[PDB]
Design an enzyme around this catalytic site. Structure first.
Site, PDB file in Angstrom:
ATOM      1  N   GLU A  53      12.739  17.541  30.661  1.00  0.00           N
ATOM      2  CA  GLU A  53      12.061  16.807  31.726  1.00  0.00           C
ATOM      3  C   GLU A  53      11.012  15.874  31.122  1.00  0.00           C
ATOM      4  O   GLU A  53       9.994  16.341  30.570  1.00  0.00           O
ATOM      5  CB  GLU A  53      11.443  17.784  32.721  1.00  0.00           C
ATOM      6  CG  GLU A  53      10.576  17.121  33.801  1.00  0.00           C
ATOM      7  CD  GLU A  53      11.268  16.002  34.572  1.00  0.00           C
ATOM      8  OE1 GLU A  53      12.219  16.344  35.346  1.00  0.00           O
ATOM      9  OE2 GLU A  53      10.870  14.852  34.388  1.00  0.00           O
ATOM     10  N   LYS A  54      11.232  14.555  31.220  1.00  0.00           N
ATOM     11  CA  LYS A  54      10.357  13.555  30.663  1.00  0.00           C
ATOM     12  C   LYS A  54       8.927  13.629  31.208  1.00  0.00           C
ATOM     13  O   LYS A  54       8.012  13.173  30.524  1.00  0.00           O
ATOM     14  CB  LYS A  54      10.921  12.169  30.919  1.00  0.00           C
ATOM     15  CG  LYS A  54      10.991  11.741  32.365  1.00  0.00           C
ATOM     16  CD  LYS A  54      11.512  10.344  32.613  1.00  0.00           C
ATOM     17  CE  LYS A  54      12.879  10.072  32.194  1.00  0.00           C
ATOM     18  NZ  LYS A  54      13.782  10.877  33.043  1.00  0.00           N
ATOM     19  N   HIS A  55       8.718  14.116  32.425  1.00  0.00           N
ATOM     20  CA  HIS A  55       7.415  14.060  33.027  1.00  0.00           C
ATOM     21  C   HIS A  55       6.427  15.114  32.540  1.00  0.00           C
ATOM     22  O   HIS A  55       5.240  15.007  32.863  1.00  0.00           O
ATOM     23  CB  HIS A  55       7.531  14.172  34.541  1.00  0.00           C
ATOM     24  CG  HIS A  55       8.091  12.974  35.208  1.00  0.00           C
ATOM     25  ND1 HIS A  55       9.412  12.862  35.597  1.00  0.00           N
ATOM     26  CD2 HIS A  55       7.504  11.799  35.495  1.00  0.00           C
ATOM     27  CE1 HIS A  55       9.560  11.657  36.145  1.00  0.00           C
ATOM     28  NE2 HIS A  55       8.428  10.981  36.063  1.00  0.00           N
TER      29      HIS A  55
ATOM     30  N   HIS B  55       9.590   8.204  28.931  1.00  0.00           N
ATOM     31  CA  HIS B  55       9.331   7.825  30.307  1.00  0.00           C
ATOM     32  C   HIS B  55       9.131   6.318  30.356  1.00  0.00           C
ATOM     33  O   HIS B  55       8.460   5.746  29.504  1.00  0.00           O
ATOM     34  CB  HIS B  55       8.100   8.567  30.879  1.00  0.00           C
ATOM     35  CG  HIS B  55       7.903   8.362  32.362  1.00  0.00           C
ATOM     36  ND1 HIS B  55       7.374   7.191  32.875  1.00  0.00           N
ATOM     37  CD2 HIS B  55       8.185   9.149  33.438  1.00  0.00           C
ATOM     38  CE1 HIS B  55       7.352   7.261  34.199  1.00  0.00           C
ATOM     39  NE2 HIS B  55       7.841   8.423  34.574  1.00  0.00           N
TER      40      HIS B  55
ATOM     41  N   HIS C 126       7.189   1.439  37.739  1.00  0.00           N
ATOM     42  CA  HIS C 126       7.328   2.871  37.450  1.00  0.00           C
ATOM     43  C   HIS C 126       6.600   3.170  36.151  1.00  0.00           C
ATOM     44  O   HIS C 126       7.022   2.745  35.080  1.00  0.00           O
ATOM     45  CB  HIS C 126       8.791   3.259  37.326  1.00  0.00           C
ATOM     46  CG  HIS C 126       9.028   4.711  37.056  1.00  0.00           C
ATOM     47  ND1 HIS C 126      10.180   5.147  36.457  1.00  0.00           N
ATOM     48  CD2 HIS C 126       8.243   5.812  37.238  1.00  0.00           C
ATOM     49  CE1 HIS C 126      10.101   6.467  36.308  1.00  0.00           C
ATOM     50  NE2 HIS C 126       8.926   6.906  36.778  1.00  0.00           N
TER      51      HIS C 126
ATOM     52  N   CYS D 145       2.649  10.513  37.772  1.00  0.00           N
ATOM     53  CA  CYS D 145       3.544   9.354  37.784  1.00  0.00           C
ATOM     54  C   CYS D 145       3.381   8.654  39.105  1.00  0.00           C
ATOM     55  O   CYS D 145       3.174   9.275  40.141  1.00  0.00           O
ATOM     56  CB  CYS D 145       4.973   9.855  37.587  1.00  0.00           C
ATOM     57  SG  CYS D 145       6.158   8.466  37.740  1.00  0.00           S
TER      58      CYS D 145
ATOM     59  N   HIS E  79       6.767   9.824  40.816  1.00  0.00           N
ATOM     60  CA  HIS E  79       7.281  11.166  40.666  1.00  0.00           C
ATOM     61  C   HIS E  79       6.193  12.257  40.696  1.00  0.00           C
ATOM     62  O   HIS E  79       6.425  13.395  40.255  1.00  0.00           O
ATOM     63  CB  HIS E  79       8.087  11.315  39.372  1.00  0.00           C
ATOM     64  CG  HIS E  79       9.310  10.438  39.335  1.00  0.00           C
ATOM     65  ND1 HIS E  79       9.516   9.457  38.367  1.00  0.00           N
ATOM     66  CD2 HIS E  79      10.418  10.432  40.137  1.00  0.00           C
ATOM     67  CE1 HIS E  79      10.687   8.901  38.601  1.00  0.00           C
ATOM     68  NE2 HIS E  79      11.257   9.456  39.647  1.00  0.00           N
TER      69      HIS E  79
HETATM   70 FE   LIG Z   1       8.200   8.935  36.711  1.00  0.00          FE
END
Ligand SMILES: [Fe+3]
Ligand SMILES: [Fe+3]
Ligand SMILES: [Fe+3]
Ligand SMILES: [Fe+3]
Lengths: 131, 131, 131, 131
Positions: free
Chosen positions: B15-17, B45, B51, B115, B118
């Site tokens: 998970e990039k976040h 990300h 974004h 984010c 997100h």
């Molecule tokens: Fe994001």
């Protein structure tokens, strides 16, 4: 009254409050660039509940552009405060930050810092970016 | 509704976040400690005008204390915006920060990141401080 | 450890730290909406150099969406500090803020506030937006 | 390069970016004072994902003191962003804020605001405090 009547410059070798920029002179286009900014670099600054550096922010001024751009604001928010009393808490945040940017045009890095009792301070440094 | 219904955890390898903390396991009392926090550590990300990661904040939770303490909030505020159009500006701020603390009791470091589309993400790591 | 283990709720009639939201129950689509958030609403909270509310932030959670969105962070940064001593400075910022939003879907307003020694506190309120 | 080379003033009747202060001319010592600051007061400013006002901060400059004091930083962090696309999200934060201060000496209120593509802007107003 203009804000800049209250933004001070000085020599960091003489004045603890000056935010000192460390960044490369020249970088490649779009490459990640480390920018370190430190208050109390050579001459230490207190970090007590009563007296501390609150933040550093960084601006980028692209050559030939009308504006500045806020790269970031970096807040240092622990100063020994606690229920048990000032200056006996578990944690202090020092006024040192490393931020990472990608630049695609040459410009000027501007650092602005704020002490809770000694106001605003600045410094600046050119950075050249490959075309 | 509680905010923590909307603060996500995950494995940064999937998970990039996830904000990833790098800090020593054990430190001396009152010594300066480097804490690096990075979003998009292993899985990248985006950082576009539309974004991007807005910030990381760090909390310290001292063992046996009722509270958290905000170590800092670190904002990443350039995302390629410009008068000439989105995504053609001169500067981007990556969601990487190094902050420096002095600790005098053991506790837990908590990273929270945001984010722009997100929401909120967290991670945490114990740190032991010499008595 | 999760951050929400350290975000407290309570009844503002019993607990000075609770951030109290004032916002309309129902609004028109895209109309400007006043949201007032106050700590120490009914029971006063100190504002000294040693002990003060640092900030309120507001999130919006749209019904049916996975995420929260940070409406804003509102910092209260003067607490009587001065060179002449703590608690004899010229200015204090109270932990009261009015922010204005335009909403186009129904959701939940979440307020989060932070005391420099008593950690994090939250509250929330539904808002209905005309379709 | 000094930051103030990039902080603009103007007439709010001609320039949408000017932060406009509303505050009483004279107040009692230590009484709560409402300060409203608005960008796009008379001439509207956009609030899109690509172009928006990011923040207003307020400083207080006490007469006869060397420094400014940051009253607060007020961030407007929702601009229609979403997974479904820019400019179709549920929430926007307008660049309007009301902050409350207690003053015990006369001084000058300074507002500084930041647009994501049009840089920094300022205005200022004297306030007299009963002795
Ligand atoms: Fe994001
Ligand atoms: Fe100082
Ligand atoms: Fe408190
Ligand atoms: Fe603009």
């Amino acid at each position: 009254m203009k804000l800049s009547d209250f933004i001070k410059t000085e020599d960091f070798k003489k004045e603890k409050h000056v935010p000192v920029i460390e960044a490369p002179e020249k970088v490649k286009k779009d490459e990640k660039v480390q920018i370190v900014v430190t208050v109390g670099k050579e001459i230490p600054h207190p970090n007590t509940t009563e007296h501390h550096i609150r933040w550093i922010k960084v601006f980028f001024q692209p050559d030939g552009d009308p504006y500045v751009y806020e790269v970031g604001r970096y807040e240092f928010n622990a100063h020994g405060e606690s229920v048990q009393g000032p200056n006996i808490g578990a944690v202090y945040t020092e006024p040192t930050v490393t931020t990472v940017v990608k630049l695609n045009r040459s410009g000027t890095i501007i650092a602005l810092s704020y002490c809770n009792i000694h106001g605003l301070w600045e410094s600046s440094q050119k950075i050249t970016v490959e075309e």
